[PDB]
Amino acid sequence: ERTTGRQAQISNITAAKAVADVIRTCLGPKAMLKMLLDPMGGLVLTNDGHAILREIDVAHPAAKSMLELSRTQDEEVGDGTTTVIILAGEILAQCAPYLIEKNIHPVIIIQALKKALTDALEVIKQVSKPVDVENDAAMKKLIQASIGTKYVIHWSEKMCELALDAVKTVRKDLGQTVEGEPNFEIDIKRYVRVEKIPGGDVLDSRVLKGVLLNKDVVHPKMSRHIENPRVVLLDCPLEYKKGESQTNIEIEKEEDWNRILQIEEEQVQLMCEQILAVRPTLVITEKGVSDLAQHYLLKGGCSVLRRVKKSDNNRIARVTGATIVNRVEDLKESDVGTNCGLFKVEMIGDEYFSFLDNCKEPKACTIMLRGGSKDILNEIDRNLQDAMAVARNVMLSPSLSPGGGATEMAVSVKLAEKAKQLEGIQQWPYQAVADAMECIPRTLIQNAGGDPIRLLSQLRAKHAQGNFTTGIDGDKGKIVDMVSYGIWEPEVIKQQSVKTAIESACLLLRVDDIVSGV
Amino acid sequence: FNNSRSDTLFLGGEKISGDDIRNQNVLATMAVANVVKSSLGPVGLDKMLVDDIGDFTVTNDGATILSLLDVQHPAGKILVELAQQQDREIGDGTTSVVIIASELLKRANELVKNKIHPTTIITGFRVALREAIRFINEVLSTSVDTLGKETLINIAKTSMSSKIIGADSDFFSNMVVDALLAVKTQNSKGEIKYPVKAVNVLKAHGKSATESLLVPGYALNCTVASQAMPKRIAGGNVKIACLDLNLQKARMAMGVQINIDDPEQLEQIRKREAGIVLERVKKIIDAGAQVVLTTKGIDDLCLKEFVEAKIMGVRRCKKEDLRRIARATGATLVSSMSNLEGEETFESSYLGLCDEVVQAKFSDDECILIKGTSKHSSSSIILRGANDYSLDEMERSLHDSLSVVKRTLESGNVVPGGGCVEAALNIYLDNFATTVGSREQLAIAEFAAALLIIPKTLAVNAAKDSSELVAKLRSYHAASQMAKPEDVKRRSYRNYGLDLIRGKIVDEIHAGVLEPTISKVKSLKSALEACVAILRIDTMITV
Amino acid sequence: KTSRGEIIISNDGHTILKQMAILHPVARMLVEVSAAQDSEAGDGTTSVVILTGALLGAAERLLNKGIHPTIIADSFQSAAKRSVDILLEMCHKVSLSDREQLVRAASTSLSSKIVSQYSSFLAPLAVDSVLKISDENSKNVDLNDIRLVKKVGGTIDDTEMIDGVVLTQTAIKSAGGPTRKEKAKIGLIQFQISPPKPDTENNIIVNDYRQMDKILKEERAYLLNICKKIKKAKCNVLLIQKSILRDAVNDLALHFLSKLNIMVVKDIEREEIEFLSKGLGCKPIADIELFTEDRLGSADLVEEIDSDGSKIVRVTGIRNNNARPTVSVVIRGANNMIIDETERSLHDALCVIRCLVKERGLIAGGGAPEIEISRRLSKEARSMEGVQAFIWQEFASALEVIPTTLAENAGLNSIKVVTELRSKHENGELNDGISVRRSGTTNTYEEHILQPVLVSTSAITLASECVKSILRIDDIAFSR
Amino acid sequence: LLNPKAESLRRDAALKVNVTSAEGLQSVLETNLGPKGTLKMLVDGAGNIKLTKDGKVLLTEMQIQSPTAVLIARAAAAQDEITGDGTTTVVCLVGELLRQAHRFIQEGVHPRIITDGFEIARKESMKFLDEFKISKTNLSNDREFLLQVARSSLLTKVDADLTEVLTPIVTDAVLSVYDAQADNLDLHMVEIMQMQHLSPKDTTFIKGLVLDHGGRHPDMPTRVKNAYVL
């Protein structure tokens, strides 16, 4: 019902400690498998961290808050989801004796974590090394880390070219002190949406800038190519309409049947005159188009395209500029579809297609995926989004950080040295954060079979003397250099690992009481 | 414990009474107070509210937590009604009201062991409550310290400390405070209500953020289109024509194509559309309007009449801006010239009186400055800075910081908070308790000592020691109130508050923490209304 | 907390004992005494229960001495008759011909409610209403004859007595409603004029033009035949009992009764059917065949007057020998909590005035008579002999529980205030009592605390009858 | 550190129980392995009685709560669909490999080296797998050698008395439907029908197809030689 005193602070720590201690074995390429026992006879043997956290049922709300962080962290970047949870859970474990045994007020710890968050991000920027994002050969080697050891390893050469051309397609590089820094505005979800086309070849798969539609020309004789096409978008379909009020039509006399037939031709023609007012070269309707409107717009010198999804029309407005209009009578002439490159209807894979593409970069596009079968397209789909997510973190900033625990130890060494010069009450919890930064590479040591006491102490001494790029190898298990042996990770993962873990750890310390009620 | 199953007094339900029900009332209000104990003040922290479904929510608002809090208890539901009374009236301060009533019940139960009758406890609170409001009314003061000191500046400075705007906020607070102070108007029958939304904030790319200028009047963002027109005209007096109807050549509709197969239709449509737009301009130059604002734009031929007449036209005006111009310039927005069967601008009826309209040259975008109209009192702020990305965050934070400033000024009678109300009234009731006496002095002493719980628990969430701060807070007001009634002072200064940001005791009047009279008076009076109703229950009959 | 889950709170002993749901049969008698205390005096339902418990506590000592409860109950009869006779000697005789004393008595009863400054017009309302219905030597006057009408809208200062009568309902809003009638005769019709609608399953199906006219002619003729019998009896105004099940008055009947110049007021509340049959001096009509002129009333003018938004109907000049001035008072106010508390405040003011009409005279409240009567019965106990003489001493000590409890509930010292009453009441007579305004013993007559003598008379009378009905129960057995 | 309606084993006890539970299934399937094995009888509870020496057929009928044996049953799912025989041998290789590693786990050896040591030995076993194998000719005259191959499969599941009866039947069933070329063979062309009330030693091979409903009439000829089918 209610939790008071200092016991609720322990309950918040044990809630995050219970979730953290389970996924400790999910870190690294050598991560051990986990066996989940469902009430049904089935079981889940996979070691995927995001798949296990979704199948775990927890009681205390702080454990659910850690699961909500994993749902957001998994959408930002592909990997490192459990790294944030383990880091956020260890900070609360290292600060547990300071918050409880030392009788320190939680706001003092929370205010200290805000300073330690900025101090930890400044160290990562100094440890990271510059990288060339404009080199096509260098980006293919950076994406290859997320390609190999997968079903696409045979197509890895074609996968790196498909992923590089896909990231370069959606991104727009702009910066200035005038309107600000957009930070390249890279969105994988909406604008990179792909259309899987059965047949063809994996190498034949191209990344096209525009909206790809599966609907062909609706008239047998019509112009299939327009030099300078003009796209017009609208909602209300082209067909015979009815009155908005109650309409009762009872026709008895033989001469009363032709009255509705004449109105049927007039109501369809009035909708076509509203479209031709701007004299468009193309007509694209969200819903279907009757055969009557096909002939009325045919005499106007424009192509008719019906049955277009609403989610596509939102992306068409980016490649065209036509403003979405509901009623055809409200259609403005400002909706012209100018700057549309090619209308080519050329068929691909025994299915008639249409090209809305152009020569410009709206930051909207539809990737054309082709392969040996539909099952191959599904394997390329999920692997392409993970390949672009790694390439996205590289394009958001020209910096790379050493992995395998080198960046984790590089922050802990600089944090312990900087906290000695502050000389304040916050100095004690800073050492707890530095001890939590050392547990991530120590976790890799425990999974590698090496001595966690001996290897961690010797690895820390190498940072105070040598460089900060010396991590732990997964295959070997001995202290080695990450840069020389080719182990690297982008900084954006390290930026979201330190920021989201500390911010979530502060929110868990802010709740000293659990309120029960609806 | 838990008195039940009485062998006598056969009834259709259980019946409790005595010290058992009086102890349950203290334990009930203690658990409810502990829910809002950590949420008191801005230094408070949010809590989790878990339902029976298993979902939850996280919010730091003490009013939303008590509404969703499940409490089964006769006195506990009284505090729920007390929480709804503060939310429907004041809307803020519900957390502090519950803590007051909770400490009163704990000290009233101690008077039971002192053999004090509860009616005397109730009467002792009612007599002290009437005289406490009188003492609160004596320390009330209007808005002061605007000249020679800085108050509203520190209000906007603390509100901007959480945003990037807080770096230059020292220079930015001078523009928001000086403006809003002069924009105040009496509305109807001397209301003197500060406007909730005014002083339209613009943006510019020039220089740094410290170059932002405060214009003594309204400033619209737009250009003059053709530069053949003078940017400064009619210095002494100028009239501004506010027109929503366009001066551009009138078309039919956006969906009507012009296709002329009949040469009679070409001459009819042309001269008709051209004859109406010239008639609209003819009624302007004849009305003596030197400034014309059109929302849909102005054509090139219709603008030529304004060039020879030195009339400044503007194309594509914002409709939401011109509706406020009509109030500031005394003009009226013209929807259409088609009123009745005639066509004309109603000269001097829709034209507002103004002093001078001059275009000041600014970096990047250039605006139109309007100063000293007939009756305006308003102003405008044009922010020049590094980029719009920062100014967009500054403009949203400026309106949010303006919200904190306009609420403090909206109430012409304010009192310093942060512990000034609880500590000053505590010391006063200590010496005032002798003026009544007759078994009621113990009730006043417990009522006064119960006021220290508000600053106490407030300093707990700030990690500072509440025993030292609350104690020293009394020593500062005690020595300050010794020579105060004598109308002579040396070192005596009252109204010392508690600043938890810097961790020191300073005056809240200069610090920028002020509360209206409606907030403190209704919070103290209603807290006793729920406290008395709990003390009046000596028996609980439950089926 | 009720079994249904409703949470209510109040200090009124009448509302507590009603919702207490006592299953103890002997303790249920205290609820009936509180009902008789409110029906007769109207005030003192809390003190009459406490006085009963003191006599039961004093009877416990009598049973310990070997005294049979029959003598205990019989001695309380002579003790109650003597306590009232002593109370009449100290009572200050007042008459109904003085209108200044009645207003002050009603104004003090209205000062205990949220409405205070607006009671200036409320005090003569209750006074003038009773003086018209009091006549002389009327003994008990039923306050049910005074109908307090609660309508939303207006203000407190707007009130109309309308001594003749006031209805609860509006007039016909359909086509043809007269809304006013002059020289009217008002009957009470429990019947309802509707086309035939049997309680079994019925349906109306018109497949042809001949079927439509067949249904219309049968309905219009059946409604007209009822309207024709009403005109033959010269009935100007009709009151139809409200029934939401079937149709009360058909719209075709409204057009028929409008052509015959007969005012129609339907949807009359069933609670007022019993009230309107008494005050108006009319008789209930079950069927139209027994509906005649002899059961009607006489009304000079019947009109619909709307102060603000109410559209309430009033009738004046009943002009009947059997019907007497039954008064219906209209109470108006803005908020719903106004007309409610005002109705209960004026109801208590009518109870205090009702006490003066049945029994003239008043006494000073605040425990003043309880102290002096206890002192006199202690001295008069020497005139008795035997077992009864000891009961007079215990009966006097049992009368001191009311003033002692008043000192305890007010925060004053129990033992100290009670001794101050015995000290001051020796030299003075009924000049001192307990008052919570001065927080001590002062003069209740100067503080405008006035308790009518009938309240203290009925409280002692009902106490002797309650304790009697208790002690006479020697056993209880299950009887089905 | 627990959740309601949940049970969990920590440290190395979770692995030791999984190995011990796998050792229980090993001892069950250790007795029936090979031609000298035993014939197990299972009872569903509805009155069905099945006697089968195959490993997978027994695992499908048995219900096991141990999640380790569930993966063993799932491991044999790909064995019958590919190999078709030797599912009991695979289980004995999984169980003993856990017992031999159990001794090294108690010594403090990290399971990754134990896991990597098995994968490295697996790759070296595949190199020795191609060296130890014997290349057999594709000629169709190897039926004499196929008789010894048929005995390897038959002697395991029976008492060896029915092997000599089923040796010519099973061997000639595959070679008859298989024309001589590279190609492949389809076992769907071989139909299996059964009839009761006779001894198992009377099992014979049918070159053609067996039909269910026969002609009923006393004058129909029983034996007809060289007839035209319509």
XYZ file of N, CA and C in Angstrom, chain C residues 28-181:
462
model
N -35.316 1.074 20.548
C -36.104 1.667 19.473
C -37.155 2.635 19.996
N -37.525 2.530 21.276
C -38.496 3.460 21.843
C -37.956 4.883 21.875
N -36.636 5.043 22.009
C -36.046 6.377 21.981
C -36.225 7.040 20.622
N -36.332 6.245 19.556
C -36.585 6.809 18.234
C -38.026 7.291 18.129
N -38.969 6.528 18.689
C -40.368 6.941 18.661
C -40.612 8.165 19.533
N -39.883 8.290 20.645
C -40.006 9.481 21.480
C -39.460 10.700 20.748
N -38.332 10.540 20.050
C -37.797 11.639 19.253
C -38.737 12.010 18.114
N -39.474 11.033 17.580
C -40.475 11.338 16.563
C -41.652 12.096 17.164
N -42.085 11.703 18.365
C -43.153 12.431 19.039
C -42.667 13.773 19.570
N -41.376 13.877 19.899
C -40.827 15.153 20.344
C -40.818 16.171 19.210
N -40.508 15.725 17.992
C -40.517 16.619 16.840
C -41.928 16.873 16.327
N -42.848 15.931 16.539
C -44.213 16.111 16.055
C -44.997 17.064 16.949
N -44.711 17.062 18.251
C -45.427 17.924 19.198
C -44.701 19.256 19.365
N -43.547 19.234 20.034
C -42.809 20.468 20.275
C -42.002 20.896 19.054
N -41.344 19.948 18.387
C -40.504 20.246 17.252
C -39.036 20.430 17.575
N -38.695 20.649 18.843
C -37.313 20.833 19.258
C -37.095 20.087 20.568
N -35.840 19.724 20.818
C -35.491 19.009 22.028
C -35.453 17.505 21.902
N -35.354 16.972 20.682
C -35.278 15.526 20.501
C -34.007 14.936 21.093
N -32.942 15.730 21.210
C -31.701 15.236 21.796
C -31.771 15.209 23.319
N -32.357 16.243 23.926
C -32.388 16.327 25.383
C -33.391 15.353 25.989
N -34.454 15.012 25.255
C -35.454 14.098 25.799
C -34.900 12.680 25.883
N -33.957 12.329 25.008
C -33.341 11.007 25.069
C -32.353 10.930 26.225
N -31.606 12.010 26.465
C -30.652 12.027 27.569
C -31.380 11.984 28.906
N -32.502 12.701 29.013
C -33.289 12.668 30.241
C -33.850 11.277 30.507
N -34.163 10.527 29.449
C -34.641 9.159 29.627
C -33.544 8.262 30.186
N -32.308 8.438 29.716
C -31.214 7.619 30.213
C -30.895 7.886 31.671
N -31.125 9.119 32.127
C -30.889 9.439 33.531
C -31.909 8.756 34.431
N -33.175 8.719 34.007
C -34.192 8.023 34.787
C -33.940 6.521 34.798
N -33.409 5.982 33.697
C -33.031 4.572 33.677
C -31.831 4.316 34.581
N -30.889 5.259 34.631
C -29.768 5.120 35.543
C -30.184 5.263 36.995
N -31.117 6.176 37.272
C -31.637 6.309 38.629
C -32.492 5.112 39.018
N -33.136 4.466 38.042
C -33.914 3.269 38.337
C -33.017 2.084 38.665
N -31.774 2.092 38.174
C -30.843 1.018 38.503
C -30.512 1.018 39.990
N -30.389 2.206 40.588
C -30.172 2.285 42.028
C -31.422 1.885 42.802
N -32.605 2.158 42.247
C -33.841 1.760 42.910
C -34.007 0.246 42.903
N -33.612 -0.410 41.808
C -33.693 -1.865 41.750
C -32.686 -2.521 42.686
N -31.566 -1.849 42.962
C -30.586 -2.386 43.898
C -31.067 -2.311 45.341
N -32.050 -1.462 45.629
C -32.618 -1.343 46.964
C -33.803 -2.273 47.187
N -34.146 -3.102 46.205
C -35.280 -3.994 46.346
C -36.622 -3.366 46.050
N -36.666 -2.388 45.149
C -37.895 -1.684 44.803
C -38.421 -2.245 43.489
N -39.713 -2.569 43.459
C -40.327 -3.127 42.263
C -40.545 -2.024 41.225
N -40.323 -2.311 39.937
C -40.409 -1.246 38.923
C -41.794 -0.642 38.759
N -42.849 -1.294 39.253
C -44.188 -0.720 39.142
C -44.294 0.574 39.940
N -43.840 0.553 41.196
C -43.803 1.778 41.989
C -42.833 2.778 41.378
N -41.737 2.290 40.790
C -40.784 3.178 40.130
C -41.450 3.912 38.973
N -42.236 3.192 38.169
C -42.931 3.827 37.054
C -44.101 4.677 37.530
N -44.782 4.257 38.598
C -45.906 5.035 39.109
C -45.441 6.312 39.795
N -44.273 6.281 40.444
C -43.757 7.486 41.082
C -43.290 8.509 40.055
N -42.850 8.053 38.880
C -42.468 8.987 37.826
C -43.676 9.725 37.266
N -44.869 9.139 37.383
C -46.077 9.825 36.937
C -46.361 11.047 37.802
N -46.334 10.875 39.126
C -46.525 12.011 40.020
C -45.337 12.964 39.971
N -44.146 12.454 39.653
C -42.978 13.320 39.540
C -43.039 14.165 38.274
N -43.597 13.612 37.194
C -43.722 14.376 35.958
C -44.837 15.410 36.060
N -45.956 15.047 36.693
C -47.054 15.994 36.852
C -46.681 17.133 37.791
N -45.845 16.859 38.795
C -45.418 17.909 39.712
C -44.367 18.811 39.075
N -43.473 18.240 38.265
C -42.442 19.044 37.617
C -43.036 20.015 36.604
N -44.135 19.633 35.949
C -44.786 20.541 35.009
C -45.518 21.648 35.758
N -46.167 21.306 36.874
C -46.879 22.315 37.654
C -45.915 23.340 38.239
N -44.733 22.894 38.668
C -43.716 23.829 39.138
C -43.199 24.675 37.982
N -43.077 24.075 36.795
C -42.616 24.819 35.628
C -43.618 25.890 35.213
N -44.914 25.636 35.405
C -45.921 26.634 35.059
C -45.893 27.819 36.016
N -45.436 27.609 37.251
C -45.373 28.707 38.211
C -44.274 29.697 37.847
N -43.143 29.200 37.349
C -42.033 30.053 36.948
C -42.142 30.538 35.510
N -43.069 29.989 34.730
C -43.189 30.366 33.329
C -43.759 31.772 33.196
N -43.243 32.519 32.223
C -43.705 33.876 31.950
C -44.824 33.803 30.917
N -46.029 34.192 31.321
C -47.192 34.058 30.453
C -47.141 35.075 29.320
N -47.304 34.590 28.089
C -47.364 35.435 26.905
C -48.634 35.097 26.137
N -49.100 36.064 25.352
C -50.320 35.921 24.575
C -50.015 36.054 23.089
N -50.886 35.460 22.273
C -50.745 35.529 20.825
C -51.135 36.885 20.253
N -51.792 37.740 21.040
C -52.175 39.059 20.554
C -50.985 40.001 20.436
N -49.852 39.661 21.047
C -48.648 40.482 20.979
C -47.783 39.968 19.834
N -47.631 40.784 18.792
C -46.836 40.407 17.631
C -45.354 40.719 17.794
N -44.977 41.505 18.804
C -43.569 41.813 19.018
C -42.825 40.656 19.672
N -43.503 39.885 20.524
C -42.863 38.750 21.178
C -42.698 37.566 20.233
N -43.618 37.399 19.281
C -43.533 36.268 18.362
C -42.417 36.462 17.343
N -42.203 37.701 16.893
C -41.136 37.968 15.934
C -39.773 37.745 16.576
N -39.594 38.214 17.813
C -38.327 38.001 18.505
C -38.083 36.525 18.790
N -39.143 35.762 19.067
C -38.978 34.331 19.300
C -38.605 33.602 18.016
N -39.155 34.038 16.881
C -38.824 33.415 15.604
C -37.481 33.889 15.066
N -37.073 35.116 15.399
C -35.797 35.629 14.911
C -34.618 34.916 15.561
N -34.759 34.507 16.825
C -33.673 33.798 17.492
C -33.521 32.378 16.965
N -34.618 31.762 16.521
C -34.535 30.431 15.931
C -33.898 30.463 14.548
N -33.959 31.605 13.864
C -33.352 31.759 12.551
C -31.907 32.235 12.615
N -31.415 32.606 13.798
C -30.035 33.046 13.950
C -29.052 31.890 14.064
N -29.539 30.654 14.148
C -28.695 29.472 14.223
C -28.362 28.900 12.851
N -28.766 29.574 11.780
C -28.583 29.100 10.418
C -27.782 30.121 9.619
N -27.286 29.672 8.462
C -26.463 30.521 7.602
C -27.189 31.812 7.247
N -28.507 31.757 7.085
C -29.301 32.939 6.770
C -29.607 33.653 8.082
N -29.127 34.889 8.210
C -29.298 35.656 9.438
C -29.864 37.040 9.147
N -29.099 37.863 8.424
C -29.536 39.221 8.121
C -30.792 39.249 7.260
N -31.050 38.195 6.491
C -32.247 38.112 5.665
C -33.454 37.575 6.426
N -33.293 37.239 7.707
C -34.412 36.773 8.516
C -35.347 37.899 8.934
N -35.001 39.155 8.635
C -35.867 40.273 8.998
C -37.241 40.141 8.353
N -37.286 39.731 7.086
C -38.552 39.460 6.420
C -39.059 38.046 6.661
N -38.196 37.141 7.128
C -38.611 35.765 7.379
C -39.333 35.613 8.710
N -38.993 36.438 9.700
C -39.617 36.313 11.016
C -41.113 36.611 10.994
N -41.596 37.727 10.430
C -43.053 37.938 10.394
C -43.782 36.973 9.477
N -43.075 36.306 8.561
C -43.720 35.323 7.696
C -44.295 34.171 8.511
N -43.492 33.608 9.415
C -43.980 32.525 10.260
C -44.963 33.028 11.308
N -44.823 34.283 11.740
C -45.731 34.831 12.742
C -47.102 35.095 12.133
N -47.139 35.799 11.000
C -48.416 36.149 10.387
C -49.143 34.922 9.849
N -48.405 33.868 9.492
C -49.048 32.661 8.987
C -49.777 31.916 10.098
N -49.217 31.916 11.308
C -49.842 31.199 12.413
C -50.996 32.001 13.004
N -50.842 33.326 13.102
C -51.887 34.154 13.697
C -53.199 34.052 12.931
N -53.139 33.773 11.628
C -54.368 33.601 10.862
C -54.996 32.235 11.111
N -54.179 31.205 11.347
C -54.684 29.856 11.568
C -54.848 29.527 13.045
N -54.450 30.431 13.943
C -54.502 30.125 15.369
C -55.910 30.272 15.931
N -56.618 31.332 15.545
C -57.940 31.669 16.094
C -57.769 31.802 17.607
N -58.549 31.097 18.422
C -58.367 31.128 19.866
C -58.770 29.781 20.449
N -58.025 29.343 21.467
C -58.284 28.078 22.157
C -58.345 26.909 21.175
N -57.411 26.894 20.227
C -57.342 25.844 19.220
C -56.492 24.658 19.654
N -55.793 24.766 20.783
C -54.942 23.696 21.327
C -53.879 23.371 20.279
N -53.714 22.111 19.879
C -52.674 21.757 18.924
C -53.069 22.213 17.525
N -52.120 22.821 16.816
C -52.311 23.265 15.440
C -51.309 22.520 14.571
N -51.815 21.712 13.642
C -50.944 20.907 12.798
C -50.183 21.801 11.824
N -48.855 21.681 11.828
C -48.027 22.434 10.896
C -48.057 21.862 9.487
N -48.615 20.662 9.301
C -48.792 20.128 7.958
C -49.765 20.965 7.139
N -50.651 21.715 7.799
C -51.512 22.652 7.087
C -50.718 23.794 6.471
N -49.524 24.072 6.983
C -48.645 25.083 6.407
C -47.712 24.375 5.433
N -47.872 24.663 4.145
C -47.088 24.029 3.095
C -45.994 24.987 2.640
N -44.740 24.572 2.801
C -43.595 25.363 2.367
C -43.203 24.909 0.967
N -43.397 25.785 -0.016
C -43.137 25.477 -1.416
C -41.734 25.950 -1.766
N -40.913 25.036 -2.277
C -39.531 25.328 -2.637
C -39.414 25.407 -4.154
N -39.048 26.584 -4.658
C -38.859 26.809 -6.084
C -37.500 27.450 -6.325
N -36.847 27.036 -7.407
C -35.528 27.552 -7.759
C -35.685 28.891 -8.465
N -34.816 29.834 -8.133
C -34.847 31.156 -8.716
C -35.340 32.203 -7.729
N -35.063 33.462 -8.063
C -35.442 34.558 -7.192
C -34.396 34.825 -6.123
N -34.863 35.319 -4.980
C -33.989 35.621 -3.855
C -34.737 35.325 -2.561
N -34.055 35.549 -1.435
C -34.672 35.304 -0.136
C -35.686 36.393 0.192
N -35.412 37.637 -0.211
C -36.310 38.742 0.104
C -37.634 38.658 -0.643
N -37.737 37.794 -1.651
C -38.967 37.638 -2.422
C -39.768 36.487 -1.823
N -40.904 36.810 -1.210
C -41.768 35.803 -0.613
C -43.209 36.294 -0.672
N -44.128 35.365 -0.931
C -45.554 35.657 -0.966
C -46.285 34.640 -0.105
N -47.089 35.130 0.841
C -47.786 34.229 1.754
C -48.871 33.443 1.030
N -49.789 34.145 0.360
C -50.898 33.535 -0.369
C -51.646 32.598 0.572
N -52.393 33.176 1.516
C -52.991 32.385 2.587
C -54.020 31.386 2.069
N -54.572 31.612 0.879
C -55.611 30.729 0.382
C -55.138 29.321 0.082
N -54.175 29.188 -0.836
C -53.551 27.915 -1.191
C -52.554 28.176 -2.316
N -51.603 27.262 -2.503
C -50.633 27.323 -3.593
C -50.419 25.909 -4.113
N -50.391 25.757 -5.435
C -50.140 24.447 -6.015
C -48.645 24.245 -6.253
N -48.287 23.021 -6.639
C -46.905 22.661 -6.925
C -46.580 22.607 -8.412
N -47.555 22.829 -9.290
C -47.393 22.508 -10.700
C -47.696 23.713 -11.578
N -47.225 23.625 -12.820
C -47.455 24.634 -13.841
C -48.792 24.365 -14.532
N -49.032 25.044 -15.648
C -50.240 24.873 -16.441
C -49.893 24.202 -17.767
N -50.913 24.020 -18.605
C -50.730 23.326 -19.875
C -49.847 24.159 -20.794
N -48.779 23.544 -21.298
C -47.887 24.181 -22.256
C -48.232 23.839 -23.698
N -49.246 23.008 -23.921
C -49.650 22.627 -25.267
C -50.562 23.707 -25.849
N -51.152 23.426 -27.007
C -52.021 24.393 -27.666
C -53.385 24.419 -26.987
N -53.826 25.610 -26.594
C -55.134 25.789 -26.002
C -55.165 26.000 -24.505
N -54.014 26.017 -23.837
C -53.975 26.219 -22.408
C -54.421 27.611 -22.007
N -55.452 27.687 -21.163
C -55.912 29.009 -20.703
C -54.918 29.706 -19.791
N -54.271 28.961 -18.890
C -53.276 29.453 -17.935
C -53.874 30.408 -16.905
N -55.125 30.821 -17.101
C -55.805 31.680 -16.142
C -57.303 31.433 -16.242
N -57.987 31.551 -15.105
C -59.434 31.404 -15.068
C -59.997 32.276 -13.956
